[PDB]
DNA sequence: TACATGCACAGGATGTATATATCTGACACGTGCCTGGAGACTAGGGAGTAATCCCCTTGGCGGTTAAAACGCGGGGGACAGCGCGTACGTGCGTTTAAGCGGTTGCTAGAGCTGTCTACGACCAATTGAGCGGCCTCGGCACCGGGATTCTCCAGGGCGG
DNA sequence: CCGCCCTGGAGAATCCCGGTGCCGAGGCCGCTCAATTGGTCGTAGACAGCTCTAGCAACCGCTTAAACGCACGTACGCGCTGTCCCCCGCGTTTTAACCGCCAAGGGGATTACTCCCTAGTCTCCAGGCACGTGTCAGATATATACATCCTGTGCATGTA
């Protein structure tokens, strides 16, 4: 049975930030749990944000507001940057 | 020099000493030291910035400039402090 | 003459304010403080009155609960006077300082 | 009755009673002649030892044996005030009051006497407030009214007659029991008035029962004999005839006479006519502003001395004393309590505070002074007064119509609730004949119910008042703030400000602030000082920056120099007290003796400033006001010029502002200069104010107290004037049929200054300013 | 020939609206499908919890000689019952006040 | 048209206390309480359906959410109330 | 011609899967509709947070002379950074240990 | 029949946990209190995990149910799936 | 005979166990305790080994954080020895007890 | 003999209790209506059930060795008592600002109605990215022998 | 001559460097399912317009209770000292955790078939939200009857 995970994406992000550093199975499982937990928090906050404003759709505005609500301080304002240009780059292509 | 600044800066001092004493009386405090009030003002300020920042975020998501009571309710819930009596 | 003992007036105030339910902070200084804090995050902010009422109710509830924890800290240290170290201990155990 | 649902959860029962008793704390809880007020002090304690050792300063123990103090004691009557000494007192309660008196009066008086940096103006101001305090305290000795008498038994003194005495400026909680003999000996007239009030022939129980059967009223060509007073004038007697004729028809009215015509005397004489002639001597109520209420009390004391007029103010104890000592003839009964008084004077605050205790009284007449306060039908005062059970009501005002027709509708619905309806406003863009017919219908509908007489129709000695509108261009700083606000520029509005807290809520408020002065904005003087005066701020470029920051200030400076050159005194009215702060600083660095009145000034300093400005030996030249302060009772006889720095939305507020100096008895031609910023939001302020004056001139002025054919033309002409925009030897204090006279003082006189940075503060002023700055460094301070 | 319509609350013997709870479950983004007995069960549980707090608050109002439940009575009822206290531990009731208690070391003497 | 729970709370109050009223603020507090308990139980049941790869929310998920959220005797009494309500609704 | 099927992650310049995040948002019962830029923004935020922890954890592995990240390095990186400690304040990392911290009262006095 | 297994959490184990917590001196009455609070905590987590197991109609208790039970109590654990 | 002063060994174990990573409770006693607690709820329960391991990690993290707050309570009361009342105060302020 | 003064008795005015009529606040109820809930029918997919694989978890011996239990001495820390001084409570007199009511125009924002378009859901064909399986070999764990670093106690030297 | 402090050396603990080996980290490959692309279409939300109400800025007046400043007394926090007891360090003995292995058996996870429950749709109808009124209960006014106290005049006595 095919089981999906964020292992290859965490690994290639690690090779970006540290090209000569490895990782273990337990640390990869912890990274997968972290990514799943943060995804669940941001998606739940955006779902509640769309519900409070009587909207049927989740757009990048709700995810941006969820990131500003959940991420503390400067870690928010870089991430708000890192999402935004990505959307802009997506707009440059699709 | 009768003219001066329009804005007021020591609005944290509007939380007066007898108000902090009354709040401690509701908490069952018998004796209060004199250094309590500045620490209480700092704690109140930190709590108020934490709630008000999230409420302003909820206000700006709705493309509004008026902070409603429901935004204050949503903000407190997200900080783990559910408040009844204003949700309806 | 007839001066009261130091402590019985405090006990009368404890027994009075633990029975009552009104807000212990005047409304206008709290509105001024909320507007002063809120203008740092965003300029030209309007406020509904019930928003400031809810902020006041939450603020006094938070401070009263913190004062109960602070009093427990002061009693634990063989004292009856609350000190700033009791507030830092209560907020450290609660996870606000941790 | 019985619950149909119960809980199966096995919880323990809980006492939810949160009521507490402090009885166990009674172990630490329980188990009137003292010092109240210290009035005056004398430098000789017992005898004059000598004039030596008059230098240095005394200490507290030195003053403990050198001075004797006048003491009013606790629960006393200001007649048992004793000259005492610290050793003669011992240890009573209230010694801290004596210590505080001795401390601040003696040490502050001796340091203001012995300082070298004390001018003559400060010492005469301190002397006049010193004697003002002594005259206010000496007024308390005189009785004003005797409330009740009793027979009290003293310590083996058999029976003594004891009077309950109220004092002049004191209230009913200072009413005291006193001996009869000295009270008769010092003021027997009040005692005689008390026995006249005792077996009086006029009571509410002796009132007639006119129920739609009131007798016809004949016109009185002479003053009636029961109104003693002074002498009623002809227009006042005509007003008496009008109020009596309206009462005989069972109708209510508005006495819309202008201020200074004595509306108080007219309604007191009408109350006297209602009591004496028609025998309607029951409970009447007059609701007045608190500031004018002594002027009602002495009017009742002078013109109607036989009446039982009572005064209803004060705290809970004083009003309780009035309630259970003076309302009822039989206060100790339990059934129907008949009323004892005739007239009750009260204020709006105690109408709202005591609507339960005063609404349950069958009032026979009601008189509301300053009824423009009743102009809002949704106000709490309107709901409180409209719920009263009153037969006949009357409104006394000067401005029945102020902003829109809805206020007049509220007034006539307070008077006659239902027979008059107003549902259509007045639009100047239509200007059709149907609106003119509606206006004439409103003319003919409220014509007999409003009596308005004008200060120009009677008393043929009043000088004319001329209003000149001066429109000045904006400065560069005002123009750039106007552009930054109007095209919102938060980044540009912040600029060099460290805090950057600029509030752009209420755009029109900020536009009016920019039209007045740039210095009303935060961190705005620093940019002007560092951009032109290069930041030195050495006492001479500050005034220049004040003058050329605003375009109104150059016209104000030229006007003040020209009026100082002539023999004129000037008032300046502003809508904001921060603008008054800017003008006060301008006249402080300018060096002009000014006095100021706004809402922050308490009433004692207000009366001090008014008496100082109106004294014949006054060095004051300029008197600044916030426009909506002080009420209608400010007397400004000596001033001649009125400058409206800031126009009001309500033109009646500017009308009372002009009428502070344009009272009855003015000896000089009053000149009004209105300062207007060009191409700004103040122009539509004046447009709305002009439209409101057109509306007030239509309904009220054409329905006061072959021309009907020309009315259909001149109403169309005044609607064409109201439908047109007014904005398309200057400063002379001189001026060389009524329909064309209203076309005056709506013209706009443009003023061009064209004064650059290097003209003002001339060689006379610059030499005086530089020598004062150089001499200040020599004397340090 | 439609039959006489009766509410789903009356079928389950409830006072709380089963249809409104079903509509809020369907539009609340909880699952793709909602079962038939789930709004009945949830309305019964909500009605029971309302009954518990309303009974305790009516007792609190009766003990303080009052005929209307105010927020103080709700706060006293919730905080005096430990199961309802820990159900609403992180819940602030507005205009509710606190439980009156003083620590024993702050008492003056025996 | 405000979509509140006030009338049903009033009927429940008349069931448990037929001669006791309720203020508007207390009614708002009860409305907020019912909404809070609704969203807690529905969120826990949604999570329970997602954890077991189920596309529907049944009375089993609501029952498990009730015994997960409510403590002690409250949980078992609410399970009893909901079970007999489901039984009464099914049979008729 | 199907234009070689360029993925959305390469279009957004990301290493996290935009398509998988879109499928998890659609199947996660969050809203009826999901916008096009929401998975892009969310995948970018997730990749940024992953890089932020992984760089500090690689630094922690380097400071203890290791070329492989273990859970101890992740715990040291999370607890030593002020904002990741607030993000993961109620989070246990298994086999993570604690920060070495001794209170100064307990230290010996010299 | 399993009984008296709370004494299997020995005194040196509690001392080691306190040493990791930074505790220098330990009173003799600490260990019974620590055993009691551990029993209360384990009862709460195990009861929620058994509820999650019983909902799934399963007899074994998986680690993922324990992760769910710790998530429900605000005590998120990384490294066992999720 | 050689002797250490009372306390330096305790600092040595504090430095040792704050550097270490492994579980400080033995596996079989914790597994037996988990099974005894679990049989009170449902009889005939099986357990994955990873379930017992996750329970052990959560339990030791809970106890280590509780001992940190207990040490803060003891230091606040001018003591270096932790008492059961310090655990009670820490759990009371944290909201677990009351 | 007549005028002035002390003492006792009977009828008139007043306060209070009670029956009846009127005003004011609340409560169930008539009416409209409208919108959300209910009844009836259809279809399809989610869920239930069965067969099969297979892997994992639950109950007894054997060694070994490190951890746990236990005893003992001692010393450091908890705790009680006492003294001191200072900071806080308390009362009182004075100021001040909160609270309330009020102006005046403009704008934000909720709510309702109507249009319309871009955008996301949905479906089919395609294909390439990601995942399970397999294999290997280097990063890291274990062990052994010095090197070094570290408190701890006793002895000599120096200052008081 | 005596007390304190530095230091010298003693042995325990830990670091460090080298060797060995082992087993998971990572790379390669087949495959197959989910992302991508292209097309169609319904509708969510943006936009526009109109109406009504709360908020906002800066000012006014009045009341009054709360805030504040100050002085004084005293309760309590803190520092110091003694004492005793309990916890810590260390050696010795026990014991059970840990690793490994045994034997079977049952619980949980893919693939196929079926069936029934719920979404969807249409139609109908009644539950609930507002108004607005007849009626009931509490409070108040009004007329009437009984208990209670102030008061004027006749009888008797003293005096010129």
Automatic annotation (TrEMBL), chains C, I:
**Oligomer status and interactors:** The nucleosome is a histone octamer containing two molecules each of H2A, H2B, H3 and H4 assembled in one H3-H4 heterotetramer and two H2A-H2B heterodimers. The octamer wraps approximately 147 bp of DNA.
Membrane-crossing ranges are none
* Similarity comment: Belongs to the histone H3 family.
Please give the Gene Ontology molecular function terms for this protein: DNA binding; protein heterodimerization activity; structural constituent of chromatin
The species is Xenopus laevis
Domain Core Histone H2A/H2B/H3, chain residue ranges per copy: 6-93
* A GO CC annotation given for this chain: nucleosome
Q: Mind listing the UniProt keywords for this protein, alphabetically?
A: Acetylation, ADP-ribosylation, Chromosome, DNA-binding, Hydroxylation, Methylation, Nucleosome core, Nucleus, Ubl conjugation
**Range covered out of full length:** 39 to 136 of 136
Listed name of the protein: Histone H3
**What superkingdom heads the lineage?**
Eukaryota
Compartment(s) where it occurs, according to its Swiss-Prot or TrEMBL record: Chromosome; Nucleus
UniProtKB/TrEMBL annotation, chains E, G:
The biological process GO terms on file are: heterochromatin formation
Q: Mind telling me which GO cellular component terms the entry cites?
A: nucleosome; nucleus
**For bias kind Basic residues, which ranges apply?**
1-9
Q: What keyword terms does UniProt attach to this protein?
A: Acetylation, Chromosome, DNA-binding, Isopeptide bond, Nucleosome core, Nucleus, Phosphoprotein, Ubl conjugation
Does the record bear Ribosomal protein in its keywords?
no
Q: Which Gene Ontology molecular-function terms are recorded? A: DNA binding; protein heterodimerization activity; structural constituent of chromatin
Specify the Histone H2A C-terminal domain's residue ranges.
Answer: 82-110
State the family it belongs to.
Belongs to the histone H2A family.
Q: What quaternary structure, including any partners, is listed in this protein's UniProt entry?
A: The nucleosome is a histone octamer containing two molecules each of H2A, H2B, H3 and H4 assembled in one H3-H4 heterotetramer and two H2A-H2B heterodimers. The octamer wraps approximately 147 bp of DNA.
Output this protein's name: Histone H2A
Native species: Xenopus laevis
First-to-last residue of the parent protein present: 11 to 120 of 130
């Amino acid at each position: 049975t095919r089981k999906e995970s964020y292992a290859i994406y965490v690994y290639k992000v690690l090779k970006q930030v540290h090209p000569d550093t490895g990782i273990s199975c337990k640390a990869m499982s912890i990274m997968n749990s972290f990514v799943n937990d943060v995804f669940e928090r941001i998606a739940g906050e955006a779902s509640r944000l769309a519900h409070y404003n009587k909207r049927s759709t989740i757009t990048s505005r709700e995810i941006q507001t969820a990131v500003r609500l959940l991420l503390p301080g400067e870690l928010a304002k870089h991430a708000v940057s890192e999402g935004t240009k990505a959307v802009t780059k997506y707009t440059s292509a699709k | 020099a009768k003219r001066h600044r329009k804005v007021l800066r020591d609005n944290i001092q509007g939380i007066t000493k007898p108000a902090i004493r009354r709040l401690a009386r509701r908490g069952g405090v018998k004796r209060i030291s004199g250094l309590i009030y500045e620490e209480t003002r700092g704690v109140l300020k930190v709590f108020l910035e934490n709630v008000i920042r999230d409420a302003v975020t909820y206000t700006e998501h709705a493309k509004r400039k008026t902070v409603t009571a429901m935004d204050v309710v949503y903000a407190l819930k997200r900080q783990g402090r559910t408040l009844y009596g204003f949700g309806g | 003459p007839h001066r009261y003992r130091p402590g019985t007036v405090a006990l009368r105030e404890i027994r009075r304010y633990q029975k009552s339910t009104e807000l212990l902070i005047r409304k206008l200084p709290f509105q001024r403080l909320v507007r002063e804090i809120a203008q740092d995050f965003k300029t030209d902010l309007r406020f509904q009155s019930s928003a400031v009422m809810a902020l006041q109710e939450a603020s006094e509830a938070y401070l009263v609960a913190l004062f109960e924890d602070t009093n427990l800290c002061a009693i634990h240290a063989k004292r009856v006077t609350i000190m700033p170290k009791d507030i830092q201990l209560a907020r450290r155990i609660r996870g606000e300082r941790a | 009755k019985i619950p149909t649902r119960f809980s199966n959860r096995q919880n323990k029962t809980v006492n939810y009673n949160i009521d507490y008793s402090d009885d166990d704390l009674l172990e630490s809880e329980d188990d009137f002649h003292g010092i109240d007020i210290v009035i005056n002090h004398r430098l000789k304690t017992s005898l004059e030892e000598g004039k030596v050792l008059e230098k240095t300063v005394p200490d507290l123990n030195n003053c403990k044996e050198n001075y004797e103090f006048l003491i009013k004691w606790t629960d006393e009557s200001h007649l048992h005030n004793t000259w005492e000494t610290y050793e003669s007192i011992g240890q009573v309660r209230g010694l801290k009051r004596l210590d505080n008196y001795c401390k601040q009066f003696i040490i502050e008086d001796q340091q203001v006497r012995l300082d070298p940096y004390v001018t003559a103006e400060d010492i005469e101001i301190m002397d006049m407030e010193r004697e003002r305090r002594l005259d206010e305290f000496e007024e308390f000795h005189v009785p004003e009214r005797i409330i009740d008498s009793q027979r009290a038994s003293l310590e083996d003194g058999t029976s003594q007659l004891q009077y309950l005495v109220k004092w002049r400026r004191l209230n009913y909680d200072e009413a005291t029991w006193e001996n009869a003999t000295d009270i008769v000996k010092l003021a027997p007239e009040q005692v005689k008035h008390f026995q006249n009030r005792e077996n009086s022939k006029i009571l509410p129980q002796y009132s007639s029962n006119y129920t739609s059967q009131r007798p016809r009223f004949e016109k009185l060509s002479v003053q009636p004999p029961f109104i003693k007073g002074g002498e009623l004038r002809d227009f006042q007697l005509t007003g008496i005839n009008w109020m009596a004729f309206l009462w005989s028809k069972g109708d209510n009215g508005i006495l819309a006479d202008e201020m200074g015509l004595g509306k108080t005397v007219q309604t007191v004489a009408f109350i006297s006519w209602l009591i004496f002639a028609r025998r309607q001597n029951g409970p009447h109520i007059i609701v007045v502003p608190l500031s004018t209420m002594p002027a009602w009390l002495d009017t009742f004391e002078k013109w109607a001395p036989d009446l039982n007029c009572i005064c209803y103010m004060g705290n809970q104890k004083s009003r309780d004393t009035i309630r259970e000592y003076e309302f009822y003839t039989n206060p100790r009964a339990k059934g129907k309590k008949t009323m004892k008084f005739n007239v009750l004077l009260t204020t709006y605050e105690y109408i709202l505070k005591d609507r339960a205790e005063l609404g349950s009284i069958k009032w026979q007449f009601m008189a509301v002074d300053e009824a423009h306060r009743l102009k809002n039908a949704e106000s709490s005062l309107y709901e409180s007064l409209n719920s009263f059970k009153v037969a006949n009501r009357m409104l006394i005002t000067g401005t029945p119509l102020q902003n829109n027709i809805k206020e007049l509708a509220a007034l006539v619905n307070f008077l006659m609730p239902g027979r008059f309806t107003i549902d259509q406003e007045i639009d100047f863009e239509n200007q059709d004949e149907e609106q003119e017919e509606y206006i004439h219908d409103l003319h003919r509908r409220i014509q007999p119910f409003i009596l308005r007489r004008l200060k120009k129709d009677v008393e043929k000695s009043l000088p004319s008042k001329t209003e000149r509108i001066l429109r000045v261009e904006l400065s560069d700083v005002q123009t750039e703030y106007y552009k930054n606000i109007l095209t919102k520029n938060y980044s540009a509005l912040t600029a060099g400000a460290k805090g950057g807290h600029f509030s752009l809520l209420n755009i029109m408020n900020e536009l009016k602030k920019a039209s007045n002065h740039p210095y009303l904005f935060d961190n705005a003087e620093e940019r002007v000082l560092q951009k032109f005066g290069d930041g030195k701020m050495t006492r001479e470029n500050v005034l220049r920056g004040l003058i050329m920051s605003s375009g109104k200030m150059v016209l104000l400076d030229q006007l003040l120099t020209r009026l100082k050159k002539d023999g004129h005194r000037v008032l300046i009215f502003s809508q904001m007290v921060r603008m008054l702060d800017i003008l006060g600083d301008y006249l402080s660095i300018k060096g002009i003796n000014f006095q100021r009145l706004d809402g922050t000034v308490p009433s004692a300093q207000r009366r001090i400033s008014i008496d100082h400005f109106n004294s014949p030996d006054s060095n004051d030249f300029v008197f600044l006001l916030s426009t909506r302060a002080g009420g209608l009772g400010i007397n400004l006889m000596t001033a001649d010029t009125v400058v409206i720095f800031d126009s009001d939305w309500n033109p009646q507020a500017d009308l009372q502002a002009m009428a502070r100096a344009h009272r009855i008895g003015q000896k000089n031609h009053v000149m009004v200069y209105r300062l207007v910023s060009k191409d700004t939001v103040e122009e539509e302020v004046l447009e709305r104010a002009r439209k409101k004056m057109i509306l007030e001139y239509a309904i009220i002025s054409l329905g006061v107290t072959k021309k009907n054919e020309p009315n259909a033309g001149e109403l169309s002409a005044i609607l064409k004037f109201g439908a047109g925009n007014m904005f398309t030897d200057v400063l002379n204090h001189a001026e060389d049929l009524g329909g064309e006279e209203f076309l005056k003082q709506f013209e706009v006189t443009d003023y061009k200054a064209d004064i650059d940075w290097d003209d003002i503060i001339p060689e006379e002023e610059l030499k005086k300013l530089q020598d004062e700055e150089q001499k200040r460094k020599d004397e340090e301070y | 020939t439609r039959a006489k319509a009766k509410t789903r609350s009356s079928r389950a013997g409830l006072q709380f609206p089963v249809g409104r709870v079903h509509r809020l479950l369907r539009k609340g983004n909880y699952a793709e499908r909602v079962g038939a007995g789930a709004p009945v069960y949830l309305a019964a549980v909500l009605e029971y919890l309302t009954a518990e707090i309303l009974e305790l608050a009516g007792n609190a109002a009766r003990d303080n000689k009052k005929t209307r439940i105010i927020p103080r009575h709700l706060q006293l009822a919730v905080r005096n019952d430990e199961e309802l206290n820990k159900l609403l531990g992180r819940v602030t009731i507005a205009q509710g006040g606190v439980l009156p208690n003083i620590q024993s070391v702050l008492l003056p003497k025996k």
